[PDB]
Swiss-Prot record:
Protein name: Peptidyl-prolyl cis-trans isomerase FKBP1B
Places the protein is found: Cytoplasm; Sarcoplasmic reticulum
GO CC entries: calcium channel complex; cytoplasm; membrane; sarcoplasmic reticulum membrane; Z disc
Reaction(s) catalysed (UniProt annotation): [protein]-peptidylproline (omega=180) = [protein]-peptidylproline (omega=0)
Gene: FKBP1B
GO terms classed as biological process: 'de novo' protein folding; calcium-mediated signaling; insulin secretion involved in cellular response to glucose stimulus; negative regulation of calcium-mediated signaling; negative regulation of heart rate; negative regulation of insulin secretion involved in cellular response to glucose stimulus; negative regulation of release of sequestered calcium ion into cytosol; neuronal action potential propagation
Tissue-specificity statement: Detected in heart muscle (at protein level). Isoform 1 and isoform 2 are ubiquitous with highest levels in brain and thymus.
Stored InterPro entries: FKBP-type_PPIase, PPIase_dom_sf, PPIase_FKBP_dom
Family membership noted in the UniProt record: Belongs to the FKBP-type PPIase family. FKBP1 subfamily.
Amino acid sequence: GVEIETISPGDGRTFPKKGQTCVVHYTGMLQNGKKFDSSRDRNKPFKFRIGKQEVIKGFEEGAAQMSLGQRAKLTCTPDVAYGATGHPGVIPPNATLIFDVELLNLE
């Protein structure tokens, strides 16, 4: 389940496609919890592509449902990313994830 609550401005037409390398200022957030991840800290804004399942599934569908300049807010279910397993020491099992995502990409 992917839920989008878009902070408005951007273009709304340039959509991410396959074979496209994209740049995301992501920010991790725990539901009823503190932060766990931020691309704003390292300031190297995480160049990655679409179509190799490099990212988790909840972040994957949220990438395609955005456009250039936009600023969405993800809501990831536990079963698509880590809710069965839990990432060791960082993300507990059965965890619901919140993301602050801005798409300022190329291609």
